[PDB]
Amino acid sequence: MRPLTDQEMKIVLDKLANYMTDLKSLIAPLEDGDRYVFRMQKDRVYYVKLSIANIATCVARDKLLSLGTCLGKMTKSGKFRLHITALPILAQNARYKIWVKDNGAQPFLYGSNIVKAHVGRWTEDCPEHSGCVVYNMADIPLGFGVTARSTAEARRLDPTGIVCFRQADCGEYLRDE
Amino acid sequence: LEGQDAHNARSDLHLDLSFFITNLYRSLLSLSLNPDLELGNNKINLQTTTVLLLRCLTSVLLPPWNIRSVPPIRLA
Amino acid sequence: RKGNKNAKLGSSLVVLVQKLEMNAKFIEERRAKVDFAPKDRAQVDAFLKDLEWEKTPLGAYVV
């Protein structure tokens, strides 16, 4: 493994602040004098406890395949892409939320965009290109993405209309099987 | 913040009560141990610290606006 | 310990708080499996009916 560099952590925190509300909560120290850290193994970043990372160093580089929760990967062009594996953190501290009925929840898992015919609840005053985590009617985190229009435009929108751009969904777990 | 104009101004004016909520949550224990609690039309100037605590708790848990949107984590 | 210099009371309070923490950890250890459904309180109405106040860490300290 290797800790993130300053620019790499700047990029990762830019994306994380795009999708989440508070981040000092993530990097806050815990009761037992332990804290969460960020590490990179084979152009993947992993959110993991410092104790777990320090006990995972005994593993040789070629043999470490996972550690904690995989947030995403840094691409060859130097940009961070977030993952459905990083969805749980997003659910914990999400900024904007979008609830979808079953009729759109199943398509969202199949890998389709969210539609006004699917939306069942909004978050008031959501700007155009903002960070919204997609849940179902049972408050179960289903995915995350960036919304298409604002709340007013979505309300005025044709019900057969795109309201959210899909970026990651729980169906990729059915892929990596 | 429960004022109507301020309630609609909320997001645009960037008015976050997170500090006040956290301070109340952290001070609950010291207030519980404080023995001076019951030594005592108006909306603010109330002489009893218990009454002030009740008003804060009503504001945080049972708000005039968005009563059924309160975070379940906060409620619990 | 940032008051006075009253070390005997300091030590006595340290021992008391230690015992309090130990007894708190004891009850929670034996609490885990106690079904307290709102319409079923048999287990909680039994908790430790079969223990006496010298077995708890606070009981030992107080005696």
Added chain:
Amino acid sequence: VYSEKELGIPQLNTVTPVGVTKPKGKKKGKVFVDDRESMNTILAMVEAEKQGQIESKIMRARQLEEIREARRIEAEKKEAERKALLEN
């Protein structure tokens, strides 16, 4: 439109200092960010550019002030580490 990283554009000295440049196509030392203080500094900066324009002057002052506090704490931590590794 083509990237200034693609083009071999020399760095120019402005009000913002160029600083100690490094040779091209060589080892640029990785400064690892792992301290909570540096994390706080970066995180506060990111939140500042994300929130952006705030109507209230005290709001602006407090955002800039928390960034300044994070930077001071980070610098103090590095100075303490330097003294530790120099004497002991």
Added chain:
RNA sequence: AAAUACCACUACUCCUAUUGUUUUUUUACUUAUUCAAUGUGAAGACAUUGUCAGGUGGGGAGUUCCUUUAGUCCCUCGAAAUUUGAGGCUAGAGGAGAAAAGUUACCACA
């Protein structure tokens, strides 16, 4: 699998007692030790600390090992008893250097 009469041995498992050795846990106390002061107090057998053996090392300084193949049934190491698996020997094949690089009948855009 193993066959009981007869008499010879040692193999483990569970209890007991004293005519004894060590090791570990809990607790008690200061003399090991930790903290404060100057022209003695508190803490405490745990910490902290030290040494050898290793694991990792995308960070710092310096310089330009495993896997497969065939053979002798040659040695060791494990394992089941009437045999194996892993190392070892011989010589073919795999793995300027943290900056980045190579590649694809794939993808999006131009």
